[PDB]
Amino acid sequence: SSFKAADLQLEMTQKPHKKPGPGEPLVFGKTFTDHMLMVEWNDKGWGQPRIQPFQNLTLHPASSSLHYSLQLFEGMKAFKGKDQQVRLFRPWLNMDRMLRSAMRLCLPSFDKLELLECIRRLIEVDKDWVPDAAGTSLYVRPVLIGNEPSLGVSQPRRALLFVILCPVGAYFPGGSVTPVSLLADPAFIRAWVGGVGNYKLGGNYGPTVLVQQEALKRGCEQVLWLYGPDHQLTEVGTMNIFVYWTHEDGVLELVTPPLNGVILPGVVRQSLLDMAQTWGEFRVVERTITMKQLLRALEEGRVREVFGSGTACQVCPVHRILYKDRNLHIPTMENGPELILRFQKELKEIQYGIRAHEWMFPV
Amino acid sequence: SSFKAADLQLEMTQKPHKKPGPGEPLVFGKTFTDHMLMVEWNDKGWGQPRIQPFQNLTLHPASSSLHYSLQLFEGMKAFKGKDQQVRLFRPWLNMDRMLRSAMRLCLPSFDKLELLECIRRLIEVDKDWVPDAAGTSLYVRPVLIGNEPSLGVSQPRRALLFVILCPVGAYFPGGSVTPVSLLADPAFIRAWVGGVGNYKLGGNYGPTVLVQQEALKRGCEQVLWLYGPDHQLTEVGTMNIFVYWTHEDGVLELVTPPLNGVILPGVVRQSLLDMAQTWGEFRVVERTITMKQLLRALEEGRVREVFGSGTACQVCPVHRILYKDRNLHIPTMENGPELILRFQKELKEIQYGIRAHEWMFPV
């Protein structure tokens, strides 16, 4: 059924593009690498995978990817250490999530490890594009779209899988943690139980653009997505949320919302849970967090740190939440931020190859 | 600002496709006409509109239309009367809805009447493609997509508006209306209040494919979309729902769910409400309909007709609903279907120019 890496076609570029410098401030995903991966699917099966020069897609105007959002994507980073070795961070989890997303949209199944090997081969070809400066990396963007020339809402009989790469600079200006303010208004819903918010589908993102603009108009940087009558904290923009506090039972704990359907199962999210569990210094749980619980904890001075997690930012500190038109200062930066700095340090040691780990996949 | 229809550039096809013609099977949305409308948008506003030959779209791999579902569409029909005159059905309402969809996804605004004249000119160029057989029409598909070559989840600085046309056959070949069976399972949710289900965005359709396949496996043609703990009937597949019954207060009425956020404001839906209100023979109301209300009405023999409404089907009868592993028989067909046939006949007479009406826009 699946495409094989052993069947890979190679077409090197004879028109190389200008590489960005470590000194020039880069915007997220605007400058791309020399090559891309492309695999075509039809009802008879997958075609042969190919590494070809970066080029535009040729799509039929009726392609189901453009009309009925038969599209999904992934996002992972490749890191270059001082010894020039490029490594991907827990890519197996991204491949797992990509296949789950594909099944939800009735898009073709593929072998997760064959796609991983094809992606490894692609990054190997564009190795010189992976930067080595502090906090920089190569963003990998796999995409699977429906491509049937039909206006009928049905299972695609044609599909296209492609992977593009882009060098990204340091998220924080310089190399120090800067906090974000969040708008928490229950009128905005990102996902729902029985919905598709737990899959990385394009459809979950388009509607967020206007809401993010509303957050900016109200003086906030990101949106704190609330869910249900009890105003459950779900996500911070397009990042998973973590709260480090002394809970109502008097125990020091790190909590993040559980995977009940409205939470996207983040790779960094899973890594922070795994890392903190291994330390065994405090309680680490997956449990629902409500605004009522957070309000009470803040007034009682029990909150230490609140942060967002994702591939783009790793660990993003939160200093303010605007809920029901009331400002809530989150003492994250006044508490170090001890845990965020510890997570940042240990993730960078694993990611840049200072410490050898099972989480890293060598390219 | 907006693009002007007076600036329209026409490039006719050098390679015309063979038309289906007399007695050939037409599958919905699989056969396309010779030309298409294309309008580009960037930083300096809209470009000049163009009618060019039917061809593939050239999109950058990072196009926000494919990653974050910055896409919307419309659907309306052009009808050809026996004397060869082509007319559009209430297109102003589709233009109004398209603009509302554009605003929700932070896509560029345009003038409703300028796009309408551009679509009229496109249908005029491909006028011979509009079939004249009973119940047949030309399906018009306007689309507006984000076309930003960036991986950032933001408002597009580039967009593309295009319109494609499809000659379609009669939904009920021979003229006789045929009913369908619906699967009603609360585990599947189409939209949520605070979401975007009330807009015609690509994102709302992709997730329905898997649900539709499950309905088919269970022996049902469409999905009856239920919402909330009270199991509110919202939509029949991707069509609005109508119930013709004797209400609990003993009064005969035609009811459809209100525009509370989870219902897409259909043009046919509004047309049926307008038509039924003009007659003044029964009560016409927009009120929430629950499964418990329908169950009580069925056993008491108060339900006369249940149907779906939309551009593709016009008025679609329902004879069975599979709910909680039990089959509920809906007496739609044995009741004529009196109201459905009256709606079908009046709409047919208006659409094919047999009866003059302000609802029709001449091409």
Ligand SMILES: *Cc1c(COP(=O)(O)O)cnc(C)c1O
């Ligand atoms: C991508 C994403 C995340 C984080 O996932 P990572 O795998 O850790 O990058 C969290 N929430 C949403 C809504 C996301 O889209």
Ligand SMILES: *Cc1c(COP(=O)(O)O)cnc(C)c1O
């Ligand atoms: C298109 C659509 C309708 C019907 O709208 P019409 O304008 O009458 O064609 C109803 N519900 C959904 C979900 C739709 O997508």
Ligand SMILES: NCC1(CC(=O)O)CCCCC1
């Ligand atoms: N929040 C940004 C991401 C996830 C992340 O990497 O943190 C989601 C939207 C698309 C870009 C990536």
Ligand SMILES: NCC1(CC(=O)O)CCCCC1
């Ligand atoms: N139900 C089919 C439509 C609406 C309609 O015309 O009934 C929505 C999906 C795309 C095709 C059109």
